[PDB]
Amino acid sequence: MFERFTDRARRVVVLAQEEARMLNHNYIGTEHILLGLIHEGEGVAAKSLESLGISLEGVRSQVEEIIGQGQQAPSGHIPYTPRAKKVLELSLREALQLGHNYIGTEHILLGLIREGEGVAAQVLVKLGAELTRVRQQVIQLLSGYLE
């Protein structure tokens, strides 16, 4: 299904792996997808997060507090966690329901909040961004693009 991801959405997933690698992590979790969506910095997901006051530094701080780093950075392919798999599966359905034939950054963010339970969701809530508020902000921004 990655063939259906936009260029930017693929860049988010590629960057998520390196977010994990550079924190000496050995799985790509939902929190690395969240870091990737912000750090990529251009798409509707990054805009939605920025527009709710969710910054890369806030997320980094919470990841260090909740997860912490390993001792060495791994080489080679880092596997998705079960919850990160579910986020990427759910992104497909968020896109179709919103009338998109491609999976964009915003659909990955919507998948993340649909899954709603993993480390990324915990971080968002701790930083004051309730799941429904995030979804509604994505809808508000997408509505502006219909002008």
């Binding site: 299904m1 990655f2 693929r10 997933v13 590629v14 392919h77 880092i78 596997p79």
Partner: peptide, 7 residues
């Protein structure tokens, strides 16, 4: 799809 980047 769905285990690693980008399978």
């Amino acid at each position: 799809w769905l285990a690693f980047v980008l399978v």
